[PDB]
Amino acid sequence: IFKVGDTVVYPHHGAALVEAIETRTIKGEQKEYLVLKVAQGDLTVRVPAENAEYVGVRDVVGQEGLDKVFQVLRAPHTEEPTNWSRRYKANLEKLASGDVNKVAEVVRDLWRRDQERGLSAGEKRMLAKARQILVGELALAESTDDAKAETILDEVLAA
Amino acid sequence: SFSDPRFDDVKAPVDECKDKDMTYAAPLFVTAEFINNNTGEIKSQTVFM
Amino acid sequence: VRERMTTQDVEAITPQTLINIRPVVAAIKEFFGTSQLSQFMDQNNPLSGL
């Protein structure tokens, strides 16, 4: 599955690259830990090859996944009722889910909010971090530059 | 788990510290390490201390 | 660390988010200043400095 140079997503730390796989033994078992280090967090994280999908690591989103996430960011109005604190807990859970589709739904909801009403400090920090991780994902899914992805966001948010 | 305390060079030379009231100091970096037993990982960084 | 070791969500924490240095830095800074073994260097000549 995985090899050196695999541009890979890692919940929750977003995108990151692998340097190698070290032949380390734990409990008499020479496990093949893959040594992966992220760019955002600035840290390395090595993990067994086996439990990759179990912890939740994933190949970068393919172009059809990109199309679906754009379609989810261009999604309809479907919204939550009153108790914004209820929605705060909800969309924070969504963020914690680490799925690109759900995170896009988070950022789209907060976009329709801060466009119209105006968030609070916690709301804006929420939207900021969500947009950060989503920009990282899009930049490394299109295989493009940073500001390009945010521009694609603001232009897809517009429609 | 912690390990490997290393000092970078001082941030201000002595005389300028004494002048501007800067306390003559130097940063600590400590290579931390987080390990989950149930699944098995490492979260190794270079923390500013 | 062990306090927020569980309040945080597993498979999401980083040591940077676990480690809080503020108590360390406060402890040091309240040692060198304001502690009866951290004194003004009594320098009214080289011998007193020594």
Side-chain angles (χ1 to χ4, degrees), chain B residues 1-2 32-35 43 45 47, chain C residues 1-10 12-23:
Chain B
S1 178
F2 293 104
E33 180 180 0
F34 180 83
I35 291 169
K43 267 63 185 300
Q45 297 181 359
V47 176
Chain C
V1 170
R2 66 178 61 192
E3 195 277 331
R4 67 178 67 187
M5 187 70 75
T6 63
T7 64
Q8 296 292 321
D9 57 352
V10 296
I13 63 92
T14 195
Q16 183 67 42
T17 59
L18 289 180
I19 296 167
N20 199 166
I21 64 173
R22 292 178 64 252

Side-chain angles (χ1 to χ4, degrees), chain A residues 10 45-48 51 55, chain B residues 34-36 39-43, chain C residues 11:
Chain A
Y10 180 79
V45 172
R46 72 186 64 257
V47 169
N51 52 7
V55 66
Chain B
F34 180 83
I35 291 169
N36 201 165
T39 173
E41 296 87 1
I42 70 162
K43 267 63 185 300
Chain C
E11 291 96 5

Side-chain angles (χ1 to χ4, degrees), chain C residues 13-47:
Chain C
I13 63 92
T14 195
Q16 183 67 42
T17 59
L18 289 180
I19 296 167
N20 199 166
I21 64 173
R22 292 178 64 252
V24 162
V25 65
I28 293 169
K29 189 272 296 296
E30 71 92 15
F31 177 73
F32 280 95
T34 68
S35 174
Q36 64 186 356
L37 276 70
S38 177
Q39 300 175 357
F40 285 170
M41 179 180 177
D42 183 73
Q43 58 183 359
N44 55 9
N45 59 3
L47 183 65

Side-chain angles (χ1 to χ4, degrees), chain B residues 23-39:
Chain B
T23 182
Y24 181 79
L28 277 176
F29 289 165
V30 175
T31 301
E33 180 180 0
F34 180 83
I35 291 169
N36 201 165
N37 293 318
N38 291 320
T39 173

Side-chain angles (χ1 to χ4, degrees), chain A residues 47-114:
Chain A
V47 169
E50 300 87 1
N51 52 7
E53 71 276 15
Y54 293 159
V55 66
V57 66
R58 179 185 63 249
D59 297 332
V60 69
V61 172
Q63 295 84 17
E64 70 278 16
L66 182 276
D67 296 331
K68 292 184 287 293
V69 299
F70 277 163
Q71 189 174 4
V72 174
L73 191 148
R74 294 179 180 179
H77 187 74
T78 298
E79 73 280 17
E80 62 97 30
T82 60
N83 290 320
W84 76 276
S85 178
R86 186 177 295 168
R87 68 172 173 267
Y88 185 84
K89 186 181 287 185
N91 60 9
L92 181 56
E93 183 183 4
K94 292 180 182 178
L95 195 285
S97 68
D99 182 76
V100 172
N101 299 115
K102 297 181 72 66
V103 176
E105 195 276 331
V106 175
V107 294
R108 66 181 288 274
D109 195 1
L110 294 181
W111 182 247
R112 288 183 179 177
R113 288 180 69 190
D114 60 355

